[PDB]
C-alpha cells in the first residue's frame, strides 16, 4: 500500500504515522491493565478486541463533522481525528474520549483552514459531551506558500536592462499573461504603459489556491480560542511526538497538560532563522530553544517520554486518576493498600525528600521491605519534577480516591541554570533554593498545579511546610509577590475538597498561612495540623526580637535568677552609699550580661509555645490536630464523606439556586437529625458512619433525602412562577387560561373554589 | 492635643493622619476639575462644600458595618472607611466610592481581627454596590504578640540551677499563678511533682488577649480571598503611603491597580529579617526590596507619585476614565479635540516613539505648535511605563470616549538589571530589547494591561505592530510561550469592543497574530489594517529562504536575464569543442552568482506583495482597509456605535435571555428595515448615521422588546409548569389576584 510508503515517511521523521495511533492506544491500554493490577485490585481484563472501539471523525461538504467507518490511509487533510471509547481498569464499563492529530505526511503536517475546521469541530465535540480531548500534535504550524500561477511569468521592470543592480521599479504581467489570470482572482494589477510597452503593474498577489494565504491567520487563532476555552471546559491533554511550531506550539500550552517525547521540540521559531539574524552560527539545534531541556525544566512540559508508545501510554495513565467526563465524579478503585493501616515512614526536623513522605521508600536496615507512605503504594506520579523543585506536585490515590498533591521539598535544591550561547558572558551558573520556601517558580508551579488538577476535578491535599516566600531583593524584581497572590485566586476557584495539613515537624508561616488559610474558600477548604507541628505570623526567633527584648529578659531575670533577685533585693534598701549603690548596679548588669543569651533561648522557648497546635485548634484556625501515623486513615474517611456530602449538596442546590453554601448544610444536617434521631446528632460528626449512611441515600426509605429535594424544588418553581407574574401581571389570565386546558375534572372543580 | 499629636506621628512617617484622607481627596477634586477644563467642556465647577460628601462607615456590636456620624480621631481599631459621593468633571451629577484605610498611628498599623473584618465588611459593600474600593495602604501587616499574663510569672525548669548554661527542661507555672490565669483561657498545663515542689508545665500557651494570635492568619486570608474576588467584581485602587507589609503588601497587588509615594515600599520581609536569616548585612534598607525601583520597574506598581495628594489626584484622575459603577457606563465627555480632524502625526519606517502616535508631539520647526496623535489632546495616561518598554499601555480619550490602549514601542529598548546583592558574583546587566516583538515581560504587561482594563469595563484599541515572540534560547526558557497563550485567553474573556489595527508602516505576523485574531472573541473583537500595513504568517524574506530557493532564483534568470538566456540558447549550439562548452559553462555559472544577490530581492518583492491588506480584506480576515489620516474620525463613529448597539442588544438579551447573540443581531438588523424602510437598508452600514438613530431609539424599538419579553415570560411559565404540574394548582391562587371579576367570569367558562 502507500501505507508501507507512509509509515516508512513517518519513521524517518523520528514520528509514527497517524492511523497507527488508535492501535497505539489499545496496545498501551493492555501495558495499563497489566501495570495497574500492581496497586488495585481489578476485574479480570476485556480481551484486546472488545478493550477499544474508534471511529474516524471526517469533514462534510457542509464543514460538519461527520463519524465514518473508512479503512486507514483515506484522509484528504493533514487533520485526523477519531472518538474512543474504551475499557479501563478505572473505568471497566467504559469512557469516551476524542483524540485528533496532524499527519505530518501530508503537506509537511502544515495547518491549512481545512485541517484547522476539523480540529475546531473534533474539540467542540469533546466539550459538547464533556469528554477529554486529547492532541497528539506533529507538525509545521500554519501552512505557506506563494501564488505558483503568478511566480513563473511575472517579469521585472528594470531601471536599466543593461545593468540590474541600477535597480527596478517594480513588478508586472504581459498583457498575454494577465489576460488569464485575470478570470481567477489571481492577482490585482493596473494597466500602464511604460518604455513602449503595455504592461500590469502587480499591486497585490491574492492567489487563486485556497489555503496558502492569510486565511491560515484567522483559522490558527479560531483554534487557539477554541483551546483556550477546552482548558477551561473539558480535560485536556497534548503529546508532543516530532514537533510542534507555532499555533502547533500554542495549542499544547493552551490545552497545558503536555507530554513531551525525548528529542521532539516545540517552538516558535527556528535555530536556523536566528542564527541568520545573529549574523553566525549561536545555535545548532532546534532541541537548544524547545527540546525537553528547555521545556520540561520550566514546566511547560509535564512528562518526558522516550517513544511515542510510552506517550500513549502517559495520556491513559493520566486519565485513571481523572473522571471519565465533566459530568461524573473521580473514579474510585479498591486498592490493595489497605485504608486502616499507619504510616511507617515518618517525617523528620531532618531534612528529606518528601516523595518519601508521599509514596514510602525502601527500608534503610532489613530490605527489601518497604517504609509505607501516606498515599497508596504505587499511586504518586509526579510532573513537572525538574521546575521548581522546592515543591513537588503530583496525582495519588487516598484508599482508591484519585487526588492531585502538592508537598514541600526540604532539603536545599540546586539549581542549574544553563548558558546562553546567544550571550558570549553567559556561563552556566549553579543556584541554591532553600528549602521550606516559596520562590516565584515554586508559587507559579503550585498555581499551575491547582489550577490544572481543579479542572480535571480532582479532590486536592496540600502537605503545607512553607516559612515563607522569599523576599530578597532579587525574587522581589522577580514578582514573587505577583506569584503569590496568583495561590490565592487559584484555591478560590476550587470547586471539590481542598485538604490542608501541616505534617509532623513541617511548619507554616505568615504570608504562606495566609495565602492558603481554609477562609479563601470556607466552602471546600479545610486545614489540619499534625501535632508535631507549628504556625504563627511570626516565627519564634523573629517574635523574641520584637517582642522579648533585653528590657524584658533582664525583667525575667528579676524574677527568676536567684543571683539577680538577691542582687536586686539588696538595690531595693534605702539610705545606701552611692559607692554601695553603684558596686551593685554594676554586679547586676554584669550578671545580666552572662545571663542574656541563656535566658534568650528561654524565650524563644517561650515564643515557640505559643505556636502549637492546641492553640490553633482552640482558636479556631484549624478542624482538627491529627496525629501523623493514623493520618492516612483519618483522611481517607473524611475525603470519602466530603465527596459524598457534595454530591447531595449539588442536588440541592440545584433544586433551588438562591439558597446559600451556609444555608444548605444546615439544611442536610437538620433532615439528618429529624431522619435519625435527635438522640443521634453525634453521628454527623464520625466521617466512616456519615459516609455509609449518604451514600445509602443516594443509592425503600433511602429516599428520604431525595424526596425532600422534590419539595425544595417545588417550592422553588412556585416562587420562581410568582415572581414572574408580579413583575408582569397582564400575563395572569392568559397563562390561566393555558394552564387549565387539562387538569383533573376534579381540580378544575377547586380552581372555581379560589378565585 | 490629640488629634495634633497623631498627625505629626504621621507627617513623621512620611504620611498622612488616616482623618485627613478626606479632606485630601476634596482638595485633589478641585485639581481635577482645573486639569480636565484644558481637555474638555466642562460646566462650572460646584462650589468644593458641594463637590464631595463623605460618611464614615464603623462596625457595630454584630460586626455588621454602619454608617455613623462622629468626629474624626475616634477609631477604636486600626482601620477607617467611608463611602464617598463627589460631583466630577466626568460624572458631575455625582459619583459614589468606599475608601478604606490602615491607620499607621494605631498599634504601628498592624492587622488585627478587627481591623480584618471592617476591611471585609467594607469590601463586601463595595461589592454590593457595584461602586470602586479605594485602599489607602499603610500598616505593618499583621498583628503580633505574646501573651503578657503569663510572660510575668512563668518560671524555669533548670537541669541545673548552680548552672543554667547546663541547659532547661521546660517552663512553668506555681500553683499559687496557674490558680488565676486557669479560669481565663490563658494556657494549657499538665500539674507535674518535680524536685519536691508541684508544678504546671506549660504544654500551650493560648493567651486571653485577644488579636495576638492564629486568629490573625485567618483574618488576613479572609481579606485576602476578599480582595481576589473584588478584583474581579469592581474597579479597585490601592494607594501605598509609607509602607505595605505581607498582607499589606498582598491586598495592594490583589487590587492590582497600585500607586505608590516615592520612599514607601511594598514588602513581605523587612531588610532586617533577612540580614538575620543570611547570616550577613546583605540589605540596608526596605527600599531595596520594595521601594518603586523595584516594583515599578517590575509592573506591580502601576504609577509612582511624589506625595500623598499627588497619590489621592491619580486615584481621582484614573477614576475619570472609569464607570460609576459595574452598572454603568463608560463615562463620556464633550472633549475639545474635535473628531472630525486629521491626524497629523504619521508613523514611519523609521523608528519612533509610539507615544507620539498616541498623544502626538510637538512641531520640530514652527513650535509652539502641535503635531496632533489619533486620541483626544491630553488625554492619554499611560501606567507601568519603565516595565517591559517594548509594549506600551495606558487609557486615552477618543472624542471623549474613554477607551484602553495597547501599542507597540519600535526602537530598541535598553534594559538594566540590578546586581542580586545576596549573590556577590552579581554585576548589573544591561539587555537590548528588539522593537516590534512580544518578550516575555512585554507579554505579560499585555495580558495584563487586557485584563485590568476589561474589568475597569473599558473598550480596548490595539495598534498592532508585532513582527513576532522573541523565541530564542533565554527567553524560551523563561516562559514567552505561557504568556503569549495568556494573550488569547485575556481576549477571549473580553466584555465590550476590541478594535485592533496595524497601523502604517507597522506589520503583524504569524505568532503575533495568531494570539490576537479576531476570531478568538469574534462578538467583540474587530481587525483593520492600514494600507500601508502588512501582514502574514511569515515575513518576505524567511518566506523566500523557504519558498523561493536557489533553483527557483535561477529559474527565473533563465527567463528574464537576457545574458543568461544568450548563454543558455547557446549551450544549445551543436558540435562545439569540450573547451567552448566549458567555457560557456562557466560563464552561466559566474553570471548566475553575480545575478543572485539582486534576484533575491526581487523575490522578497514578489512575497512582499502577497501580504498585502488587499489581500488580507478579500480573504476575510480584516473588516477594512483604513487610512491613517482620517482613521481617528473612523474609529470614533465605528466605537461609539458599536457601544451603542452593544447596548440595545443587551436590551434584547434581557427581555429573552434564551436568544443567541446571532439572532439578537439579526432581530435588531430586522427591526431597524421595518422602521426606516426596506429602501433604507444601506445606512445601517454606516456608523454614524445609525449611532444617531440608534441614539434616538435609546432616548418604537422599546415597544418590540416590551413584546419579546411578553413572549419569553408566557412561554417560560409554559416551561415550568410543563416541567412541574403538581405545581399548577396553586399557582393559579396567586394567579387569580391579578385579574378582573368579568375575567373570573371568563375562566369559569371553560375551568
Redesign the interface.
Do not use: C
Given at each position: 500500500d502507500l501505507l508501507q510508503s507512509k509509515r516508512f515517511q513517518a519513521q524517518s521523521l523520528g514520528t509514527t504515522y497517524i492511523y497507527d495511533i488508535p492501535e497505539m492506544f489499545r496496545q498501551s491500554l493492555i501495558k495499563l491493565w497489566e501495570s495497574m493490577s500492581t496497586q488495585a485490585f481489578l476485574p479480570s481484563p476485556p480481551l484486546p478486541s472488545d478493550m477499544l472501539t474508534y471511529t474516524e471523525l471526517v469533514l462534510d461538504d457542509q464543514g460538519q463533522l461527520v463519524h465514518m467507518n473508512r479503512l486507514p490511509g483515506g484522509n484528504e487533510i493533514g487533520m485526523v481525528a477519531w472518538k474512543m471509547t474504551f475499557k479501563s481498569p478505572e473505568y471497566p464499563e467504559g469512557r469516551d474520549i476524542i483524540v485528533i492529530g496532524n499527519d505530518i505526511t501530508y503537506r509537511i503536517g502544515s495547518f491549512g483552514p481545512q485541517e484547522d475546521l476539523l480540529f475546531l469541530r473534533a474539540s467542540e465535540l469533546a466539550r459538547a459531551e464533556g469528554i477529554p480531548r486529547i492532541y497528539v500534535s506533529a507538525n509545521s504550524?500554519?501552512?505557506?506558500?506563494?501564488?505558483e500561477e503568478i511566480?513563473?511569468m511575472?517579469?521585472?521592470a528594470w531601471v536599466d536592462?543593461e545593468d540590474?543592480?541600477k535597480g527596478?521599479r517594480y513588478?508586472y504581467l504581459t498583457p498575454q499573461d494577465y489576460k488569464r489570470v485575470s478570470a481567477l482572482?489571481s492577482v490585482?494589477c493596473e494597466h500602464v504603459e511604460d518604455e513602449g510597452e503595455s504592461r500590469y503593474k502587480?499591486?497585490?498577489?491574492?492567489?487563486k489556491e485556497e489555503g496558502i494565504?492569510?486565511?491560515?491567520?484567522?483559522?490558527?487563532?479560531?483554534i487557539?480560542?477554541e483551546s483556550?476555552?477546552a482548558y477551561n471546559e473539558i480535560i485536556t491533554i497534548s503529546l508532543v511526538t516530532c514537533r510542534a511550531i507555532?499555533?502547533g506550539?500554542?495549542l499544547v500550552?493552551?490545552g497545558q497538560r503536555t507530554i513531551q517525547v525525548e528529542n521532539s521540540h516545540?517552538?516558535?521559531?527556528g535555530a536556523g532563522?536566528?542564527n541568520?539574524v545573529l549574523g553566525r552560527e549561536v545555535?545548532t539545534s532546534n532541541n537548544?530553544?524547545?527540546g525537553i531541556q528547555?521545556?520540561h525544566?520550566?514546566?511547560?512540559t509535564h512528562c518526558t517520554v522516550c517513544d511515542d508508545f510510552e506517550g500513549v501510554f502517559t495520556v491513559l495513565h493520566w486519565l485513571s486518576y481523572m473522571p471519565k467526563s465533566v459530568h461524573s465524579s473521580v473514579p474510585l478503585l479498591n486498592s490493595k493498600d489497605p485504608i486502616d493501616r499507619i504510616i511507617e515512614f515518618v517525617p523528620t526536623k531532618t531534612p528529606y525528600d518528601p516523595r518519601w513522605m508521599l509514596a514510602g521508600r525502601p527500608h534503610p536496615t532489613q530490605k527489601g521491605q518497604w517504609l509505607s507512605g501516606f498515599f497508596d503504594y504505587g499511586s504518586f506520579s509526579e510532573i513537572m519534577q525538574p521546575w521548581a523543585q522546592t515543591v513537588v506536585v503530583g496525582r495519588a490515590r487516598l484508599g482508591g480516591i484519585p487526588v492531585g498533591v502538592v508537598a514541600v521539598e526540604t532539603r536545599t535544591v540546586e539549581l542549574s541554570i544553563?548558558a546562553?550561547?546567544?550571550?558570549l558572558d553567559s556561563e552556566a551558573?549553579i543556584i541554591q533554593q532553600a528549602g521550606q520556601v516559596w520562590f516565584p517558580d515554586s508559587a507559579f508551579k503550585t498555581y499551575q498545579a491547582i489550577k490544572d488538577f481543579n479542572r480535571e476535578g480532582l479532590p486536592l491535599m496540600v502537605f503545607a511546610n512553607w516559612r515563607?516566600?522569599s523576599?530578597?531583593?532579587?525574587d522581589?524584581?522577580?514578582?514573587?509577590?505577583?506569584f503569590?497572590?496568583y495561590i490565592?485566586?487559584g484555591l478560590?476557584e476550587c470547586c471539590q475538597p481542598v485538604l490542608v495539613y501541616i505534617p509532623p515537624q513541617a511548619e507554616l508561616r505568615?504570608?504562606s498561612?495566609?495565602?492558603?488559610?481554609?477562609?479563601?474558600?470556607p466552602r471546600h477548604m479545610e486545614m489540619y495540623a499534625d501535632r508535631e507541628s507549628r504556625?504563627?505570623?511570626?516565627e519564634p526567633?523573629?517574635?523574641v526580637?520584637?517582642?522579648?527584648r533585653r528590657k524584658?529578659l533582664v525583667?525575667?531575670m528579676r524574677?527568676?535568677?536567684?543571683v539577680y533577685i538577691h542582687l536586686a533585693e539588696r538595690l531595693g534598701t534605702p539610705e545606701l552609699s552611692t559607692a554601695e549603690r553603684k558596686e551593685l548596679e554594676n554586679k547586676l548588669k554584669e550578671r545580666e550580661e552572662f545571663?542574656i543569651?541563656?535566658y534568650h533561648?528561654?524565650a524563644v522557648?517561650?515564643?515557640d509555645?505559643?505556636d502549637?497546635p492546641?492553640?490553633?485548634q482552640?482558636?479556631?484556625?484549624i478542624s482538627d490536630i491529627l496525629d501523623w501515623k493514623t493520618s492516612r486513615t483519618f483522611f481517607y474517611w473524611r475525603l470519602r464523606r466530603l465527596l459524598l456530602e457534595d454530591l447531595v449538596k449539588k442536588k440541592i442546590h440545584n433544586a433551588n439556586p438562591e439558597l446559600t453554601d451556609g444555608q444548605i448544610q444546615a439544611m442536610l444536617r437538620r433532615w439528618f437529625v429529624e431522619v435519625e434521631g435527635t438522640v443521634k446528632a453525634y453521628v454527623w460528626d464520625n466521617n466512616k458512619d456519615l459516609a455509609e449512611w449518604l451514600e445509602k441515600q443516594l443509592t425503600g426509605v433511602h429516599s428520604v433525602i431525595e424526596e425532600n429535594i422534590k419539595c425544595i424544588?417545588?417550592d422553588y418553581?412556585?416562587k420562581?412562577?410568582?415572581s414572574?407574574?408580579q413583575?408582569?401581571?397582564?400575563?395572569?389570565?392568559?397563562?390561566?387560561?393555558?394552564?387549565?386546558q387539562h387538569?383533573s375534572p376534579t381540580?378544575?372543580a377547586?380552581?372555581?373554589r379560589?378565585?
Open positions: 504550524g500554519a501552512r505557506i506558500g506563494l501564488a511566480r513563473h511575472f517579469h521585472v536592462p540590474p543592480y527596478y513588478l482572482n490585482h502587480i499591486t497585490d498577489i491574492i492567489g494565504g492569510p486565511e491560515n491567520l484567522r483559522g490558527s487563532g479560531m487557539a480560542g483556550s476555552l507555532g499555533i506550539a500554542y500550552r493552551l516545540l517552538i516558535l521559531t532563522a536566528l541568520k545555535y537548544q530553544l524547545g528547555i521545556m525544566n520550566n514546566g511547560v544553563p546562553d550561547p546567544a550571550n551558573k515563607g516566600f523576599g530578597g531583593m532579587k522581589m524584581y522577580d514578582q514573587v509577590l505577583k503569590g497572590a490565592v485566586d478560590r505568615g504570608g498561612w495566609v495565602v492558603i488559610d481554609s477562609s479563601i474558600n504556625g504563627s505570623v511570626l526567633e523573629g517574635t526580637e520584637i517582642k522579648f524584658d525583667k525575667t524574677r527568676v535568677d536567684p545571663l543569651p541563656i533561648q528561654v522557648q517561650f515564643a509555645l505559643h502549637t492546641g492553640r490553633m482552640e482558636k479556631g484556625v424544588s417545588r418553581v412556585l420562581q412562577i410568582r414572574l407574574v413583575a408582569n401581571p397582564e400575563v395572569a389570565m392568559d397563562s390561566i387560561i393555558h394552564m387549565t387538569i381540580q378544575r377547586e380552581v372555581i379560589i378565585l
